[PDB]
Structures are given as C-alpha cells and as structure tokens.
Amino acid sequence: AECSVDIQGNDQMQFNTNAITVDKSCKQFTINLSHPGNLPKNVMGHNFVLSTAADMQGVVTDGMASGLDKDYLKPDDSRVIAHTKLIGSGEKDSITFDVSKLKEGEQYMFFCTFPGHSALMKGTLTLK
C-alpha cells in the first residue's frame, strides 16, 4: 500500500484533504506539505501537526501562545506525534514518522496551529 500523501495549504486557510488513512503495513509514513498561495508565513503560515483527537485543542491553544518564533507549537510538546515546519507561500516541507507511534482504534487529527487556522484546517488520520 502507499505510505505517502501530498497536502497543500492555501491562502483561504484550507487543507485540500480532511481525511488521511495510514495503511497498517506501512512502517513509515510521509507527508509532503506545500503552500501554493501568495501569502507569507507570518500572515498565512501552515503546518501539518498530528495528535490524538483529545489532545488537539491543547496543542493548538498552547501553540498559539508560543508565537511565530516557535512555529506556533509549544516547546517540547509530547502530545505532538509528528509535524512539519510552519511554511509560507511557495515553500515545501516533508516529514516522515514511524507508523508504530500510532495505534489501532485511536483517533488522530491533523491540523495547522497558526492562530485561527484550526477551525478550518483540520482532518482525521486513522490507522487502517
């Protein structure tokens, strides 16, 4: 099965998917994030951040509080399973994480932690 997904974040605070399934036969899983919009990171930064559904709002809230200098994630946040950099117009960043960090049954969310983006920029991820 495939163990990679391409995802874009744009100038209208939208991700171009809101559902990812990770095949259980994948040992690693890669996210390729890009930003085909015009706006820079300090205005319309997007990251791909992954947590349990339960942990999402805390990571977002503490992330807002951490500020731009920290890519809007709180330092040493163990709730974050994986994440990309926060990127701006025309940038790219990819990450690969260990699929064994995930667990069958559990619900995961991906989302952007730039202030106010997570209402519109979020989706589910599920080991299947």
Question: Under rule CB under 5 A, how many of the chain's residues touch Cu ion?
Answer: 5
Specify the residue, 39 or 99, whose C-beta has the smaller distance to Cu ion.
Answer: 39
For residue 32, give Cα distances in angstroms to 57, 88, 92, 95, 104. Answer: 23, 14, 7, 7, 23
Is 83 annotated in some ligand binding site?
no
Specify the residue, 8 or 124, whose C-beta has the smaller distance to Cu ion.
Answer: 8
Alpha carbons within 13 angstroms on the beta-carbon side of residue 88 total 8
Site pattern 88..127 for Cu ion (x: CB under 5 A): ------------------------x-x--x---x------
Cβ proximity of 4 and 17 under 8 Å: no
Contact residues for Cu ion (CB under 5 A)?
Answer: 46, 112, 114, 117, 121
